[PDB]
Write an enzyme that holds these catalytic residues in place. Structure first.
Site: not given
Ligand SMILES: [Zn+2]
Ligand SMILES: [Zn+2]
Ligand SMILES: [Cl-]
Ligand SMILES: [Zn+2]
Lengths: 204, 205, 205
Positions: A53, A72, A99, A104
């Site tokens: 996108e 994304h 982690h 975005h």
């Molecule tokens: Zn770690």
């Molecule tokens: Zn998205």
């Protein structure tokens, strides 16, 4: 596991990831589209980086992207990378994206940032040298350079982003240690792929 | 990467997913059991949808399931679908289940809903046309149709669920955009899996 | 996808996981290094367990690790397991590590624990028989045995850890149920890989 961007009304270049030969990407991961990965990047298992996108994405040198991270971007909306060009997502040099973090686009994360466990940056700039801790949401705001964000903060207004404390010296070392650990990890994984390097160690 | 449900004390039909030919499921994902996926559904990389405990699941037409999503269900407990049948999980038409969301049966999510980044729906009904934002927990409650939930809210009591604002016009417009974007992505990825379609495109480069 | 620990300044033993034949590990997952997985453990799709920095990890018998879970550890820092050995991560027997949980060493989780959806244990000790609910952070503290943690709590100081309520009998029965469910899932998935077991089941359909 890397693929071209799909043809859509907004994209037809079928762009593929550019990965530095000094970077290591774990097999158990998914990379789609114009993703530009510079030297000594470590991309861990369970990660999905999808530039279908919003596009392109930039990931700087000596940056690590840890387990289960998602990247994304919105189709509309860009930031200005340090090279003058427009990006859906820009992540700088010596950054730790830890982690289960979510980055975005549109999003700029500056050199030397630490983004802690299960934390999100969406529609936002985070200045160079920020240390953002665990279970944090940052959205619709600009965080100044060199700021510390306590765990569990939900930052959605500039008023909040304007009242953050400066990082301490201990935070700066904590951050550079994580960067160094992932450089060491990357080289070990490259050694294990090469018979000349791994054989002498395996014989001991 | 589609598998039959395992035999257990509560199940023996070894059911496998029914995937509409117009849907697109990414290779890097895992699907188990009686998962009924309707027309023009997009299932993104990293997803785990597992109908081995509670079953069946229904995912409606023009619905997207984004990266790292998990769907599971409790062995006991069901909602009534729009077809009169019992489901562990029912997700309606024109719904966005966005990055890292967790939908856990028993659950009903109505037509046109938006469920935001890293948000959870467990043992709950979310009425049609709700727009739920980021890092939200919804648990043991019913949200009325057409309500907006601000980011970070931990909704665990019906008292809280009864005091939510109505969605605004710009919320509706945002929701529909996400639906349309993903419809366009699925047809793009299907083209890439067809030599006749993608070859003439790569030739222009 | 089972991998050796990489050669590094702190470790050159190239350790690989030790997995009990009575455990079931789903194909769609990743394991790296000295991970010690005991009898009747269920490891669900989308999990990443990585013993390349902190090491070793221990996962006890009849323990389940559900979808999208991540396990990792700090290079420095260890806890003492019940066997009298040092670990980056100790998870005991009959424990539930549920959907999208993060267990980050130095971490000890005692026998009988429930760790709820999207919850984190980091640089912490959680005593035997605790029931931790949904969207919780536990960090830099010791939770005594037999304690209950409400959903959404962010615990980062011992002062918070010291004022938690005891579990109720209903929480104990709830925890054991989830353990029992995952044992039944485990033997079903193994049944499907044994032609003797699955043939008569399939012939009924
Ligand atoms: Zn770690
Ligand atoms: Zn998205
Ligand atoms: Cl998460
Ligand atoms: Zn479940």
């Amino acid at each position: 596991q890397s693929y071209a961007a799909p043809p859509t009304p907004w994209s037809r270049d079928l762009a593929e990831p550019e990965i530095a030969p000094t970077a290591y990407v774990h097999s158990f991961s998914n990379l789609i589209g114009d993703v530009r990965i510079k030297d000594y990047v470590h991309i861990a298992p369970g990660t999905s980086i999808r530039a279908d996108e919003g596009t392109p994405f930039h990931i700087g040198s000596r940056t690590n992207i840890q387990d289960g991270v998602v990247i994304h971007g919105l189709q509309q909306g860009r930031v200005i990378g340090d090279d003058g060009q427009e990006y859906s997502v820009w992540i700088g040099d010596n950054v730790s994206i830890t982690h289960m973090a979510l980055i975005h686009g549109p999003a700029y994360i500056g050199d030397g940032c630490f983004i802690g466990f299960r934390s999100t940056v969406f529609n936002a700039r985070v200045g160079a040298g920020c240390v953002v801790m665990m279970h944090v949401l940052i959205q619709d705001v600009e965080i100044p350079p060199g700021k510390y964000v306590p765990s569990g903060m939900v930052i959605t207004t500039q008023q909040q982003a304007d009242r953050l404390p400066n990082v301490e010296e201990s935070d700066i070392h904590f951050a550079q240690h994580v960067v160094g650990i992932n450089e060491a990890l990357l080289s070990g994984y490259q050694c294990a792929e090469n018979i000349a390097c791994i054989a002498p160690i395996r014989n001991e």
